């Protein structure tokens, strides 16, 4: 399944992604 | 880390912000700044974080912790941010942008709304807060000087010479004079407000200092108000006195050979609390530390791999 791989990548990336505040 | 009475950092085109200390010239922390170049950076008056402004974003970096990422980033403008700065107590941040605007920001996560906008028909080159944190001088690319007081909503416009773009401006902390330089080396010095009572903001042109045949990039006073350093595109930095406005000292990075052909300009400079040792940021992929009296360099920091166009040097109030 390719959507499962995309979901796993987006899940792992999102945790690292949000660490800062944008005003 | 920034747990020290004195700190200093440089930034340039190598996509890094270097921090170090004038002990041996060794870097402590190298913060990652990418996808844009740093126009200017400034430390917060509470000495908790730094703020570097470049190309539509202002990125704040924590000094207490060990973080290489821009914890707080500001967006919304469309062009470069030439200069930034904060209120003496860390209440509002004044950002002059490249496009047309000089605005203020609110540093509290609440609906305070003390932010205003000043719009001129010319791209801004420099902003300078008044030492009383009430007025603010704007210098744009049309030789016009907009002294705008935060008390009222009207701003005066002064043009020493049109058709030439001014590059910087500064006011000594003792509020004795007000200097500015343009893109041909001229350095006009108007007398600033003498009416501390109700902010009359009277201006009379004292003198003009003809120097810097090439472009003049930045001029800065001294915290003791006894010196004034100005850097030019001719690889020179001249420090003048405040008594007769003569040439006190001159420093240069020229090697004296015709084989280099202006290998680097002197972009920025700063004084110390004692008004004795100054730091200069050249385009030679390194920064230097000089003494205002002996002339020769005192130290050199060469950890950068590209040009260096901006630097911050903060020290203790004692000095």
Curated annotation (Swiss-Prot), chain A:
It is found in: Cell membrane; Endoplasmic reticulum membrane; Early endosome membrane; Late endosome membrane. Ubiquitously expressed, with highest levels in heart and skeletal muscle. The modification Phosphothreonine is found at residue 3. Phosphorylated at Thr-3 by AKT1 or RPS6KB1 in the presence of growth factors; the effect of this phosphorylation is however unclear. According to two studies, phosphorylation at Thr-3 by AKT1 is part of a positive feedback loop that increases mTORC2 activation. It comes from the Eukaryota. Component of the mechanistic target of rapamycin complex 2 (mTORC2), consisting in two heterotretramers composed of MTOR, MLST8, RICTOR and MAPKAP1/SIN1. The mTORC2 core complex associates with PRR5/PROTOR1 and/or PRR5L/PROTOR2. Contrary to mTORC1, mTORC2 does not bind to and is not sensitive to FKBP12-rapamycin. Interacts with MAP3K2. Interacts with ATF2. Interacts with MAPK8. Interacts with GTP-bound HRAS and KRAS; inhibiting their activity. Interacts with IFNAR2. Component of the mechanistic target of rapamycin complex 2 (mTORC2), which transduces signals from growth factors to pathways involved in proliferation, cytoskeletal organization, lipogenesis and anabolic output. In response to growth factors, mTORC2 phosphorylates and activates AGC protein kinase family members, including AKT (AKT1, AKT2 and AKT3), PKC (PRKCA, PRKCB and PRKCE) and SGK1. In contrast to mTORC1, mTORC2 is nutrient-insensitive. Belongs to the SIN1 family. The CRIM domain forms a ubiquitin-like fold with a characteristic acidic loop, which recognizes and binds AGC protein kinase family members substrates. The SIN1-type PH binds phosphatidylinositol 3,4,5-trisphosphate (PI(3,4,5)P3). It plays a dual role in mTORC2: in absence of PI(3,4,5)P3, it binds and inactivates MTOR. PI(3,4,5)P3-binding relieves the inhibition, leading to mTORC2 activation. This is Target of rapamycin complex 2 subunit MAPKAP1. It comes from Homo sapiens (Human). The lineage of its organism: Eukaryota, Metazoa, Chordata, Craniata, Vertebrata.
Curated annotation (Swiss-Prot), chain B:
There is a cross-link at residue 306 (Glycyl lysine isopeptide (Lys-Gly) (interchain with G-Cter in SUMO1)). WD repeats lie at residues 1-30, 33-73, 76-115, 119-158, 161-200, 211-250, 261-302. Signal peptide: none annotated. There is a cross-link at residues 79, 208, 238, 254, 298 (Glycyl lysine isopeptide (Lys-Gly) (interchain with G-Cter in SUMO3)). The keyword Membrane applies. GO terms for cellular component: cytoplasm; cytosol; lysosomal membrane; nucleoplasm; serine/threonine protein kinase complex; TORC1 complex; TORC2 complex. GO terms for molecular function: protein serine/threonine kinase activator activity; protein-macromolecule adaptor activity. It is found in: Lysosome membrane; Cytoplasm. Pfam families: WD40 (PF00400). Subunit of both mTORC1 and mTORC2, which regulates cell growth and survival in response to nutrient and hormonal signals. mTORC1 is activated in response to growth factors or amino acids. In response to nutrients, mTORC1 is recruited to the lysosome membrane and promotes protein, lipid and nucleotide synthesis by phosphorylating several substrates, such as ribosomal protein S6 kinase (RPS6KB1 and RPS6KB2) and EIF4EBP1 (4E-BP1). Part of the mechanistic target of rapamycin complex 1 (mTORC1) which contains MTOR, MLST8 and RPTOR. mTORC1 associates with AKT1S1/PRAS40, which inhibits its activity. mTORC1 binds to and is inhibited by FKBP12-rapamycin. Within mTORC1, interacts directly with MTOR and RPTOR. Component of the mechanistic target of rapamycin complex 2 (mTORC2), consisting in two heterotretramers composed of MTOR, MLST8, RICTOR and MAPKAP1/SIN1. Contrary to mTORC1, mTORC2 does not bind to and is not sensitive to FKBP12-rapamycin. mTORC1 and mTORC2 associate with DEPTOR, which regulates their activity. This is Target of rapamycin complex subunit LST8.
């Amino acid at each position: 399944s390719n959507t499962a791989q995309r979901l796993e990548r987006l899940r792992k990336e999102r945790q690292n992604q949000i660490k800062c505040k944008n005003i | 880390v920034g747990s020290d009475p004195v700190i200093l950092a440089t930034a340039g085109y190598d996509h890094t912000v270097r921090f170090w200390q004038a002990h041996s010239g060794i870097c402590t922390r190298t913060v990652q700044h990418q996808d844009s170049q740093v126009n200017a950076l400034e430390v917060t008056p509470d000495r908790s974080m730094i703020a570097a402004a470049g190309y539509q974003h202002i990125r704040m970096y924590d000094l207490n912790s060990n973080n290489p990422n821009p914890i707080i980033s500001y967006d919304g403008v469309n062009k470069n941010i030439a200069s930034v700065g904060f209120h003496e107590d860390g209440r509002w941040m004044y950002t002059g942008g490249e496009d047309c605007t000089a605005r203020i920001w609110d540093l509290r996560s609440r609906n305070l709304q003390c932010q205003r906008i000043f719009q001129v028909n010319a791209p801004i080159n420099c902003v300078c807060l008044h030492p009383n944190q009430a007025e603010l001088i704007v210098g744009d690319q049309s030789g016009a000087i907009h002294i705008w007081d935060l008390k009222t909503d009207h701003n005066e416009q002064l043009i020493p010479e049109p058709e030439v773009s001014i590059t910087s401006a500064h006011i000594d902390p003792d509020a004795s004079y007000m200097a500015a330089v343009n893109s041909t080396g001229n350095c006009y010095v108007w007398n600033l407000t003498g009416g501390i009572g109700d902010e009359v903001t009277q201006l009379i042109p004292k003198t003009k200092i003809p120097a810097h045949t090439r472009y003049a990039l930045q001029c800065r006073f001294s915290p003791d108000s006894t010196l004034l350093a100005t850097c030019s595109a001719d690889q020179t930095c001249k420090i003048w006195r405040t008594s007769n406005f003569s040439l006190m000292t001159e420093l240069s990075i020229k090697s004296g050979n015709p084989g280099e052909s202006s290998r680097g300009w002197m972009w920025g400079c700063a004084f110390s609390g004692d008004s004795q040792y100054i730091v200069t940021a050249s385009s030679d992929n390194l920064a230097r530390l000089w003494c205002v009296e002996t002339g020769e360099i005192k130290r050199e920091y060469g950890g950068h791999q590209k040009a260096v166009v901006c630097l911050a040097f903060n020290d203790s109030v004692l000095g």
